[PDB]
Amino acid sequence: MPIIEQVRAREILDSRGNPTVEVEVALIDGTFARAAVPSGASTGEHEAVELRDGGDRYGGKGVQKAVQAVLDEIGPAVIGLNADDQRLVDQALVDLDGTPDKSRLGGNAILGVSLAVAKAAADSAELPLFRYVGGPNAHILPVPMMNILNGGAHADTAVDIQEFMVAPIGAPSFVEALRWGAEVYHALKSVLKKEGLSTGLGDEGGFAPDVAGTTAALDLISRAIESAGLRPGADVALALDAAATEFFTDGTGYVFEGTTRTADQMTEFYAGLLGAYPLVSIEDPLSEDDWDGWAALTASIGDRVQIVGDDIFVTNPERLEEGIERGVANALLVKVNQIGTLTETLDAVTLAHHGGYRTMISHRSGETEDTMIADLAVAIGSGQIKTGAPARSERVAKYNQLLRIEEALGDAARYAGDLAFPR
Amino acid sequence: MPIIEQVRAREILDSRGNPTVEVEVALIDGTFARAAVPSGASTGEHEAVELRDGGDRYGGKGVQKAVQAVLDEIGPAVIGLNADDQRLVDQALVDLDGTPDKSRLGGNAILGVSLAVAKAAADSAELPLFRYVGGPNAHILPVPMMNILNGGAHADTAVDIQEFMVAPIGAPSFVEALRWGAEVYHALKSVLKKEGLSTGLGDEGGFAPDVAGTTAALDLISRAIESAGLRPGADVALALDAAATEFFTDGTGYVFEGTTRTADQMTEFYAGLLGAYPLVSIEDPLSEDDWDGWAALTASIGDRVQIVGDDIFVTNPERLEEGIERGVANALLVKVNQIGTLTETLDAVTLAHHGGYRTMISHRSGETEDTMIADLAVAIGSGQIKTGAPARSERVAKYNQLLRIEEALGDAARYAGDLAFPR
Amino acid sequence: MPIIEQVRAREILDSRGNPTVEVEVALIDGTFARAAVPSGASTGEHEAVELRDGGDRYGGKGVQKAVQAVLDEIGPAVIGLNADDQRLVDQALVDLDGTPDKSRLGGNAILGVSLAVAKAAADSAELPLFRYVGGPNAHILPVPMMNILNGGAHADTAVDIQEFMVAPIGAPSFVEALRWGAEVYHALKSVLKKEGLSTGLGDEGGFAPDVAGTTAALDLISRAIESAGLRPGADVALALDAAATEFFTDGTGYVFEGTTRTADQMTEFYAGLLGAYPLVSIEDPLSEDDWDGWAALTASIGDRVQIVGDDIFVTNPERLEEGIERGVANALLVKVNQIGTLTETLDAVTLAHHGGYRTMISHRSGETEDTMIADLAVAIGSGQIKTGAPARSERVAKYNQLLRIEEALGDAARYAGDLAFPR
Amino acid sequence: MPIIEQVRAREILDSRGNPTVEVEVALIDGTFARAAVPSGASTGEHEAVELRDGGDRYGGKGVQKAVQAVLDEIGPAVIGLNADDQRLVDQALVDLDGTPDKSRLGGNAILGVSLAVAKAAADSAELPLFRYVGGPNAHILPVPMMNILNGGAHADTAVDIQEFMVAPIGAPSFVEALRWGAEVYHALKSVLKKEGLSTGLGDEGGFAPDVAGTTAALDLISRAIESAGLRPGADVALALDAAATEFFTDGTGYVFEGTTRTADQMTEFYAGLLGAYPLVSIEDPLSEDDWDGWAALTASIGDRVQIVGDDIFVTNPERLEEGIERGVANALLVKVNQIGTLTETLDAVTLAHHGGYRTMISHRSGETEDTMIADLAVAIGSGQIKTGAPARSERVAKYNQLLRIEEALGDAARYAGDLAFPR
Ligand SMILES: [Mg+2]
Ligand SMILES: [Mg+2]
Ligand SMILES: [Mg+2]
Ligand SMILES: [Mg+2]
Ligand SMILES: [Mg+2]
Ligand SMILES: [Mg+2]
Ligand SMILES: [Mg+2]
Ligand SMILES: [Mg+2]
């Protein structure tokens, strides 16, 4: 039966060398699932809170407190519930915590137990995780948005756009899309090494060279796409993650490239970018509190390009409805550890689907060898995924799992190429 | 394993005394599921073709040919595939037929095998059918739209609105919604018996009295709602199924109550109805070819009420996209036997979800003791269902199955009342 | 029964974005294993060769040919053998190939099948992989040598030594050793900023600074160790990977720091290093063909430091015996894919144990999410491991698996700290 | 599961008619393994002591109270541990005893439980007892060293060496080595009968003739090897067990053959023997405490012959490290009941492997029908075994078990002939 019997937790290291929680759920017969909780560089004001130790051990980032919370409190609080009742167990956890941010028990411990329970339920049904979480109709493979060139808050560089991403929208299958992405990645590596720029990978596997500006970066990416043998826009498109909050001082304006601008001038810069390049999506173009500027930008360019809300929404339904009503950000970015449980994740992605918003399962800066977000991007049928460059196998494990998913589907699979970017 | 071993078929009677197909799929384990194929009265032409015998036996409606087709072709054509690969088996069937409307093998045989395969896959996973088809997040119980008063193409009467439906949107749970529906039904029965009107149930369990007109019918329904002890609009709302095609002569106009009117005057009549009554939804307000009039009506009153497309769309994605682009009919009506397979059903309901359209799992005129559309309306989370009045247990089996579903969910369940009719 | 039933391979991406092989050997019971084959940055003249595709697809590095080889020949050539007869299957493969380098079938396909059948002959007995491969006495956790600072043939800067490593030899347990390593890593990450340098991770997770020379690098590392809160030598030692072949022009001397030197001069440089720093191990100090210089260096400084043979031996027993005879390289470096199969690895490590040589299970430049070298370094009881810096979770997966191994052992485990570097 | 459930013990007779202990560890599954504890003719000053009854029953050698120690203390003290954790259970026993030589509970009541659990941690995994203890690479069949001619402390004779042994190093396989040993044995039996001597078997199956001097014994053995059809040195070597502690009066000297001699004289006697005969190994050449003479003898001839201590080390790691650092003897005998547990045995054999010492699993004077030392000599890959002459089926059971092992290996097996005696 799918009734929880044991809940264990241990402390491991994530892809960046910081501690994190690993939860192992054992069912009565022997079904034994294991899930590790990813982490993020920016805490925010609305996400769930990670319960860190604090002090001098591990630089104050130990998670012995969350491990102890799982081993003494959450364990018996879920031992005995029904695995296939995700909403039951997740409401149990959310009430056992009792706070609107889950900070008393930490979002990481709760998410670890939630995810391991979902994995054990999918293992029990003998379905594969994507089939369970998505049902019978889970057949779509997502377009990998590969962040190949890093800037902004990741390195000392003039550019302040965080992530520059390519998207192989013109590929016939998913495996060919992965091949094109890897080829563009190596072509860009060669192009960089040619101009005496640094080829030291950041935290996302993307490069961090000292480029002149955003336009020079996009032109370098276009050169790399051309050198691979493809056609920009018809085969490979471009995408941005601006993260304007990382350079927005409240009440003065967005200091961009040494020139203070209003929301209007940022929208003009974005319009120029969209004109001169085959951009298909921009993520967090303005700050997460400048709602009026966001509505202005959605009116201006919000039908020639996809507008992804990464920080303005925190995968919270309560902020998602408020952004739906005011006509902003016709796209969501689903990070599973910004909400704390799988159930609220599915609810927010449903709420964003029924509002005309595309979604995009995304990764964190500190990931692990867990490849669940691939299964989750296939199950919910998002048709987009953002899980880094084809390097640093914490990022490549996701692509490998998507390859295995496509092979397991077989003739049923469909690649969501160019059907995810109509504009 | 979920690999198909045997496929049988027999000929049974539906709720109206006409033959239909019953398919029994037996898996290797011992999982043995059966499913019967419903059949409606009105064929919208675009929908899949129902392969009948023709002749003198059973009035020319025998289905011995579909039974033979299942026993000689489809059986070995699916024996050996993987049950959980719904899209695999359904594409196998659709190619084995080879026609754009499945007329060579009939939509009924193909749908019977599809549904029995889905039932055996859900039984294999040991999940319940709604949990399988909907995943982990299948928790919403739909608002039952109970057709209590029949007119139009169902009896000799001055009214030409086909179905008059009530909807308990104000109930706290699903059980109380069913109770309120049954109480309104019996109150209306008493109100009818008082005025010496006929209490002979039609094909939907609804009554067929010789009332003056649409307004008199709605006033009688409001009297019945008041006599039950509830408040019209706050507790119970009203709904219409016009089926205008049943009185639309092409090139002349909608002959309503002996007066030929254009689309404009029909929209004015509908606006008057919406004003004087708490109508929340109208289904097929105009013909299925008067696209311009439909766009006009969607612009005029298509934000004060729900516009359900029953015939203008036939659960076909190719017509659904075309109706999406032209701004028409912000609601779909999902009939499983108008498309022929479960897979295309799920695809059309997905396509209508991501377009701002609410859906509504619906029944046919000739049903059976099969309660699959209840599980299907819970799984896809439509939040609405149309399965007749609480009588004629081919209609009540669905409500009973929804009660069992709610009991099995428990604390996780949520009634979709007042969240499915914002206007 | 542990008899092989199926063997199937697919093509995936490794940690560097290049293709590689992944084999999945199922057993007649249900045991289903999976092992991906690593590949290094640079190979030599004596190891087994990888069967790459060549051409334009994937930059000429596709492995579709090795996948096809597994699926047509290696598959049926082992289906039916006994899993626990590791010495049977590996000789079967080695004869089926027929060449001294496994060129006909590629070392990668052979190694994939070897490792996967080993992971199934350990999963069958329900033992854990380390307990199987090592027996009942497998209880020692190795000292992690963490490559934190990269140089030489990687960042093309003024440094020539390839890998600078730290080794927490003074820790009480393994988990504290991992903590100390991570803390030294994060301290160096800040010392770099405090000396105006870059924090771009290389291929091993180590940093790529533009520091003056070798001595400056060791001084920077010592500063980071002091800033972490530990004591150099008593808590944390140091290590080197000279990789002399990358700067040795045959017929002339080693070109170091811009000067041509003889073997004697390099030995004096290494002695000056051993002087002012707590170096415990140097790897490949001279080229893999300068045997006489190797004997000289072994007799000179082979009593005060460990001498690791990385290229002078390729995990080949036939070269290992010769290096044993002439008195060189008191330590071996075990890379599993430089010999092509598990059995030859076990034989070479046995041969190096019975000769007074310490061993060190090592990683390749392109790894995957496979964590077999952790189990293998616990099983053979090497007491040392070299698997990169605590970053880039293709490196951190090994440390996480070693943590799980220590937790599973419990009181039995012993950390081999300060018992692996007597000199 | 490998969790101990029941532990029993009874008192049986060994090969010499003295009582001994027989333990029967049972597992929860049904795994039921028994193991009898051997006992030597004479103990020393550092082994673990046997807990004899003392008194008049069985000549004071009863073990009725070591049988009781297992049924009242050790039983519940191990019932519940994990079989595959040899380190765990063996440390549990060693602490439950609490003495430096296991005297409180006897070194026979503990070793029985150790062995009978290991015979269930191998029976459970369905591996054979030799694959478990040695892993997957256990393939080497040892060179049988057959003691065919007894002298010294065994019979009233002018011979001073204890055991004269032959070793078929030139055989192609193990079965041919056993055949050659048996043929030499019968040839010697015929030569003895033909030269007017006695054929009374000692405690090892070897003969006890009344011959004069060592040289005459080696000449008899060489004549038997010649008469068998072989040639000394190329086919069959020779070996000695001086056991010189049995005639070393401390402070006076090695009185033998009517000459009191110092350690220096014995080295010349051994050198003369080594010259005139093809000796490959001498066991206990000088004494249990004459360390300086041992170092001298190791310097003198310790690279032209193997030096076995057996008594100078007692399979105790503590004395082994001292003998390593002083580098006295090139080899040791691994007697499992001189250390008390299986774990400490493996630890000492590992410690002596990594020091340049070859090992030799050996038997005791009083053995049983237990054939564990064969499985243990092939698992640790010692390449040598000393288990008596091919007679007295307590000694032949070991050879029969090695034959079964060689048959079960198949093509994987390798005979360690002439690779175990390079000198
Ligand atoms: Mg962020
Ligand atoms: Mg972002
Ligand atoms: Mg109809
Ligand atoms: Mg209708
Ligand atoms: Mg190399
Ligand atoms: Mg190296
Ligand atoms: Mg003795
Ligand atoms: Mg002896």
CSV table of N, CA, C and O in Angstrom, one decimal, chain C residues 82 84-88 91 121 124-125 127 131-139 342-343 346-347 350 353-356 358 380-381 408-412 414, chain D residues 82 84-88 91 121 125-127 131-139 342-343 346-347 350 353-356 358 381 408-412 414:
chain,number,residue,atom,x,y,z
C,82,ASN,N,27.1,-15.5,-16.1
C,82,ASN,CA,26.8,-15.4,-14.6
C,82,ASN,C,27.3,-14.1,-14.1
C,82,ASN,O,28.5,-13.8,-14.2
C,84,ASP,N,27.8,-12.8,-11.1
C,84,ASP,CA,28.9,-12.9,-10.0
C,84,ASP,C,30.2,-13.5,-10.6
C,84,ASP,O,31.2,-13.5,-9.8
C,85,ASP,N,30.3,-13.9,-11.8
C,85,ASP,CA,31.5,-14.4,-12.4
C,85,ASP,C,32.1,-13.2,-13.2
C,85,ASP,O,32.2,-13.2,-14.4
C,86,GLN,N,32.5,-12.2,-12.4
C,86,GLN,CA,33.2,-11.0,-13.0
C,86,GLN,C,34.4,-11.4,-13.8
C,86,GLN,O,34.7,-10.7,-14.8
C,87,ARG,N,35.1,-12.4,-13.4
C,87,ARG,CA,36.3,-12.9,-14.1
C,87,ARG,C,35.9,-13.6,-15.4
C,87,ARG,O,36.7,-13.8,-16.3
C,88,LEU,N,34.7,-14.1,-15.5
C,88,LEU,CA,34.2,-14.7,-16.8
C,88,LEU,C,33.8,-13.6,-17.8
C,88,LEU,O,34.3,-13.7,-18.9
C,91,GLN,N,36.7,-11.4,-19.3
C,91,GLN,CA,37.5,-12.1,-20.2
C,91,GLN,C,36.7,-12.4,-21.5
C,91,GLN,O,37.3,-12.3,-22.6
C,121,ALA,N,25.4,-7.4,-10.1
C,121,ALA,CA,25.9,-8.5,-9.3
C,121,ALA,C,26.2,-8.0,-7.8
C,121,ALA,O,26.5,-8.9,-7.0
C,124,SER,N,22.0,-7.6,-6.9
C,124,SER,CA,21.4,-8.9,-6.8
C,124,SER,C,21.5,-9.5,-5.4
C,124,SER,O,20.5,-9.7,-4.7
C,125,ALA,N,22.7,-9.6,-4.9
C,125,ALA,CA,22.9,-10.1,-3.5
C,125,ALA,C,22.4,-9.2,-2.5
C,125,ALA,O,22.6,-9.4,-1.3
C,127,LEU,N,23.6,-6.8,-1.3
C,127,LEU,CA,24.7,-6.0,-0.7
C,127,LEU,C,24.8,-4.6,-1.4
C,127,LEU,O,24.3,-4.4,-2.5
C,131,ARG,N,30.4,-3.0,-0.4
C,131,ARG,CA,30.5,-4.2,0.4
C,131,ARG,C,30.8,-5.4,-0.5
C,131,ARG,O,31.6,-6.3,-0.2
C,132,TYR,N,30.1,-5.5,-1.7
C,132,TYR,CA,30.3,-6.5,-2.6
C,132,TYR,C,31.8,-6.5,-3.1
C,132,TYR,O,32.5,-7.4,-3.0
C,133,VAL,N,32.1,-5.4,-3.8
C,133,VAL,CA,33.5,-5.3,-4.4
C,133,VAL,C,34.6,-5.4,-3.4
C,133,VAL,O,35.7,-5.9,-3.8
C,134,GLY,N,34.3,-5.1,-2.1
C,134,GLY,CA,35.4,-5.2,-1.1
C,134,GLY,C,35.3,-6.3,-0.1
C,134,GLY,O,36.3,-6.6,0.6
C,135,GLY,N,34.2,-6.9,0.0
C,135,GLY,CA,34.0,-8.0,0.9
C,135,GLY,C,33.4,-7.6,2.2
C,135,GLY,O,32.5,-6.7,2.3
C,136,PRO,N,33.7,-8.3,3.3
C,136,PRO,CA,33.2,-8.0,4.6
C,136,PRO,C,34.0,-6.9,5.3
C,136,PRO,O,33.5,-6.2,6.2
C,137,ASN,N,35.3,-6.8,5.0
C,137,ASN,CA,36.2,-5.9,5.7
C,137,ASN,C,36.2,-4.5,5.1
C,137,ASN,O,37.1,-3.7,5.4
C,138,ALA,N,35.3,-4.2,4.2
C,138,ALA,CA,35.3,-2.9,3.6
C,138,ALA,C,34.7,-1.9,4.5
C,138,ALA,O,33.5,-1.8,4.7
C,139,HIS,N,35.6,-1.1,5.2
C,139,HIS,CA,35.2,-0.2,6.3
C,139,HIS,C,35.9,1.1,6.3
C,139,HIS,O,35.6,1.9,7.1
C,342,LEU,N,36.5,-3.7,-15.2
C,342,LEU,CA,36.7,-3.7,-13.7
C,342,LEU,C,37.7,-4.7,-13.3
C,342,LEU,O,38.6,-4.4,-12.4
C,343,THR,N,37.7,-5.9,-13.9
C,343,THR,CA,38.7,-7.0,-13.4
C,343,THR,C,40.1,-6.5,-13.6
C,343,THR,O,40.9,-6.8,-12.7
C,346,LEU,N,41.0,-4.2,-10.7
C,346,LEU,CA,41.2,-4.9,-9.5
C,346,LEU,C,42.5,-5.6,-9.5
C,346,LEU,O,43.2,-5.6,-8.5
C,347,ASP,N,42.9,-6.2,-10.6
C,347,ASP,CA,44.2,-6.9,-10.7
C,347,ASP,C,45.4,-5.9,-10.5
C,347,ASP,O,46.3,-6.2,-9.8
C,350,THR,N,45.6,-4.8,-6.9
C,350,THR,CA,46.2,-5.8,-6.1
C,350,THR,C,47.7,-5.8,-6.3
C,350,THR,O,48.5,-5.9,-5.4
C,353,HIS,N,49.3,-3.1,-4.5
C,353,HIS,CA,49.3,-3.2,-3.1
C,353,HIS,C,50.4,-4.1,-2.6
C,353,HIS,O,51.2,-3.7,-1.7
C,354,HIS,N,50.5,-5.3,-3.3
C,354,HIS,CA,51.6,-6.2,-2.8
C,354,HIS,C,53.0,-5.7,-3.2
C,354,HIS,O,53.9,-6.5,-3.0
C,355,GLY,N,53.1,-4.5,-3.7
C,355,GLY,CA,54.5,-4.0,-4.0
C,355,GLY,C,54.9,-2.8,-3.1
C,355,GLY,O,55.9,-2.2,-3.5
C,356,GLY,N,54.1,-2.5,-2.1
C,356,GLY,CA,54.5,-1.3,-1.3
C,356,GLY,C,54.0,0.0,-1.8
C,356,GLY,O,54.4,1.0,-1.4
C,358,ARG,N,50.9,2.7,-2.4
C,358,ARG,CA,49.6,3.2,-2.1
C,358,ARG,C,48.9,3.4,-3.4
C,358,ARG,O,49.5,3.7,-4.4
C,380,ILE,N,38.0,-1.3,-2.3
C,380,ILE,CA,39.4,-1.7,-2.3
C,380,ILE,C,40.2,-1.2,-1.1
C,380,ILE,O,41.4,-1.5,-0.9
C,381,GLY,N,39.6,-0.3,-0.3
C,381,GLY,CA,40.3,0.2,0.9
C,381,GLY,C,41.5,1.0,0.6
C,381,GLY,O,42.5,0.8,1.2
C,408,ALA,N,25.8,4.4,6.5
C,408,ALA,CA,25.4,3.0,6.4
C,408,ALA,C,26.3,2.1,7.2
C,408,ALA,O,25.8,1.2,7.9
C,409,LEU,N,27.6,2.3,7.2
C,409,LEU,CA,28.5,1.6,8.0
C,409,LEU,C,28.2,1.9,9.5
C,409,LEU,O,27.9,0.9,10.3
C,410,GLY,N,28.3,3.1,9.9
C,410,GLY,CA,27.9,3.5,11.3
C,410,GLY,C,29.2,3.4,12.2
C,410,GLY,O,30.2,4.1,11.9
C,411,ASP,N,29.1,2.6,13.3
C,411,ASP,CA,30.2,2.5,14.2
C,411,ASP,C,31.4,1.8,13.5
C,411,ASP,O,32.5,1.9,14.0
C,412,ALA,N,31.2,1.0,12.5
C,412,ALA,CA,32.3,0.2,11.9
C,412,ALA,C,33.2,1.1,11.1
C,412,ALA,O,34.4,0.8,11.0
C,414,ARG,N,35.9,3.8,9.6
C,414,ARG,CA,37.1,4.4,10.1
C,414,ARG,C,37.6,5.4,9.0
C,414,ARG,O,37.6,5.0,7.9
D,82,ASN,N,23.3,-7.1,12.5
D,82,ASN,CA,23.3,-7.3,11.0
D,82,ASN,C,24.4,-8.2,10.6
D,82,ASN,O,25.6,-7.9,10.9
D,84,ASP,N,25.8,-9.0,7.7
D,84,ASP,CA,26.8,-8.5,6.8
D,84,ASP,C,27.7,-7.5,7.5
D,84,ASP,O,28.7,-7.1,6.8
D,85,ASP,N,27.5,-7.1,8.7
D,85,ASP,CA,28.4,-6.2,9.4
D,85,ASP,C,29.3,-7.0,10.3
D,85,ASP,O,29.1,-7.1,11.5
D,86,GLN,N,30.3,-7.6,9.7
D,86,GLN,CA,31.3,-8.4,10.4
D,86,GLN,C,32.0,-7.5,11.4
D,86,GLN,O,32.2,-7.9,12.6
D,87,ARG,N,32.3,-6.3,11.0
D,87,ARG,CA,33.0,-5.4,12.0
D,87,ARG,C,32.1,-5.1,13.2
D,87,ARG,O,32.6,-5.1,14.3
D,88,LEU,N,30.8,-4.9,13.0
D,88,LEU,CA,29.9,-4.6,14.1
D,88,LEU,C,29.8,-5.8,15.0
D,88,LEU,O,30.1,-5.6,16.2
D,91,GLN,N,33.2,-6.5,16.9
D,91,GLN,CA,33.5,-5.5,17.9
D,91,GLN,C,32.6,-5.7,19.1
D,91,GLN,O,33.0,-5.5,20.2
D,121,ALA,N,26.2,-14.7,6.5
D,121,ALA,CA,26.3,-13.5,5.7
D,121,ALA,C,26.8,-13.8,4.3
D,121,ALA,O,26.8,-12.9,3.4
D,125,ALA,N,23.4,-14.0,1.0
D,125,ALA,CA,23.6,-13.4,-0.3
D,125,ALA,C,23.7,-14.4,-1.5
D,125,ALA,O,23.9,-14.0,-2.6
D,126,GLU,N,23.6,-15.7,-1.1
D,126,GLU,CA,23.6,-16.8,-2.0
D,126,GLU,C,25.0,-16.9,-2.7
D,126,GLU,O,25.2,-17.8,-3.6
D,127,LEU,N,25.9,-16.0,-2.4
D,127,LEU,CA,27.3,-16.2,-2.8
D,127,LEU,C,27.9,-17.4,-2.1
D,127,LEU,O,27.3,-17.9,-1.1
D,131,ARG,N,33.5,-16.3,-2.3
D,131,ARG,CA,33.3,-15.1,-3.0
D,131,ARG,C,33.0,-13.9,-2.1
D,131,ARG,O,33.4,-12.8,-2.3
D,132,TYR,N,32.2,-14.2,-1.0
D,132,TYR,CA,31.9,-13.1,-0.1
D,132,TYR,C,33.2,-12.5,0.6
D,132,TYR,O,33.5,-11.3,0.4
D,133,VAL,N,33.9,-13.4,1.3
D,133,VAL,CA,35.1,-12.9,2.0
D,133,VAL,C,36.1,-12.2,1.1
D,133,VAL,O,36.9,-11.4,1.6
D,134,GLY,N,36.2,-12.6,-0.1
D,134,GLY,CA,37.2,-12.0,-1.0
D,134,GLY,C,36.7,-11.1,-2.1
D,134,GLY,O,37.5,-10.5,-2.8
D,135,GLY,N,35.4,-11.1,-2.3
D,135,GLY,CA,34.9,-10.2,-3.3
D,135,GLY,C,34.6,-10.8,-4.7
D,135,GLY,O,34.4,-12.0,-4.8
D,136,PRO,N,34.7,-10.0,-5.7
D,136,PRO,CA,34.5,-10.6,-7.1
D,136,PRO,C,35.8,-11.1,-7.7
D,136,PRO,O,35.7,-12.0,-8.6
D,137,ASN,N,37.0,-10.6,-7.2
D,137,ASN,CA,38.2,-11.0,-7.8
D,137,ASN,C,38.9,-12.2,-7.2
D,137,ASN,O,40.1,-12.5,-7.3
D,138,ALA,N,38.1,-13.0,-6.4
D,138,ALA,CA,38.6,-14.2,-5.7
D,138,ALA,C,38.7,-15.3,-6.7
D,138,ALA,O,37.7,-16.0,-7.0
D,139,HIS,N,39.9,-15.6,-7.3
D,139,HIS,CA,40.0,-16.6,-8.3
D,139,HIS,C,41.3,-17.4,-8.2
D,139,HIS,O,41.4,-18.3,-9.0
D,342,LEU,N,37.0,-13.4,13.0
D,342,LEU,CA,37.3,-13.3,11.6
D,342,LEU,C,37.8,-11.9,11.2
D,342,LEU,O,38.7,-11.8,10.3
D,343,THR,N,37.2,-10.9,11.8
D,343,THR,CA,37.6,-9.5,11.4
D,343,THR,C,39.1,-9.3,11.7
D,343,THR,O,39.8,-8.8,10.8
D,346,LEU,N,41.3,-10.8,9.0
D,346,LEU,CA,41.4,-10.0,7.8
D,346,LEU,C,42.2,-8.8,7.9
D,346,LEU,O,43.0,-8.4,7.0
D,347,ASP,N,42.1,-8.1,9.1
D,347,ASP,CA,42.9,-7.0,9.3
D,347,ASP,C,44.4,-7.3,9.4
D,347,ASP,O,45.2,-6.6,8.8
D,350,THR,N,45.6,-8.1,5.8
D,350,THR,CA,45.8,-6.9,5.0
D,350,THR,C,47.0,-6.2,5.4
D,350,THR,O,47.9,-5.8,4.6
D,353,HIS,N,49.9,-7.9,4.0
D,353,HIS,CA,50.0,-7.7,2.6
D,353,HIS,C,50.7,-6.4,2.2
D,353,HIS,O,51.6,-6.4,1.4
D,354,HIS,N,50.2,-5.3,2.8
D,354,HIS,CA,50.7,-4.0,2.4
D,354,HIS,C,52.1,-3.8,3.0
D,354,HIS,O,52.7,-2.7,2.8
D,355,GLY,N,52.8,-4.8,3.6
D,355,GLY,CA,54.1,-4.7,4.0
D,355,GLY,C,55.1,-5.5,3.3
D,355,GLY,O,56.3,-5.6,3.7
D,356,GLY,N,54.8,-6.2,2.2
D,356,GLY,CA,55.7,-7.0,1.4
D,356,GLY,C,55.7,-8.4,1.9
D,356,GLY,O,56.6,-9.2,1.4
D,358,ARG,N,54.1,-12.2,2.1
D,358,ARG,CA,53.2,-13.2,1.7
D,358,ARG,C,52.6,-14.0,2.9
D,358,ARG,O,53.2,-14.2,3.9
D,381,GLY,N,43.1,-14.6,-1.4
D,381,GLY,CA,44.1,-14.7,-2.4
D,381,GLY,C,45.5,-14.9,-1.9
D,381,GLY,O,46.4,-14.3,-2.4
D,408,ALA,N,33.8,-24.8,-9.5
D,408,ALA,CA,32.8,-23.8,-9.5
D,408,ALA,C,33.2,-22.5,-10.2
D,408,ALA,O,32.4,-21.8,-10.8
D,409,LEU,N,34.5,-22.2,-10.0
D,409,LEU,CA,35.1,-21.0,-10.7
D,409,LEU,C,35.0,-21.2,-12.3
D,409,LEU,O,34.5,-20.3,-13.0
D,410,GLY,N,35.4,-22.4,-12.7
D,410,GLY,CA,35.4,-22.6,-14.2
D,410,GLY,C,36.6,-22.2,-14.9
D,410,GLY,O,37.7,-22.4,-14.4
D,411,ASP,N,36.5,-21.4,-16.0
D,411,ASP,CA,37.6,-20.9,-16.7
D,411,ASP,C,38.3,-19.7,-16.0
D,411,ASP,O,39.4,-19.3,-16.3
D,412,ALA,N,37.6,-19.2,-14.9
D,412,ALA,CA,38.1,-18.0,-14.2
D,412,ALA,C,39.3,-18.4,-13.3
D,412,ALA,O,40.2,-17.6,-13.1
D,414,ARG,N,42.7,-19.7,-11.5
D,414,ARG,CA,44.1,-19.7,-11.8
D,414,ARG,C,44.9,-20.3,-10.7
D,414,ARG,O,44.6,-20.1,-9.5
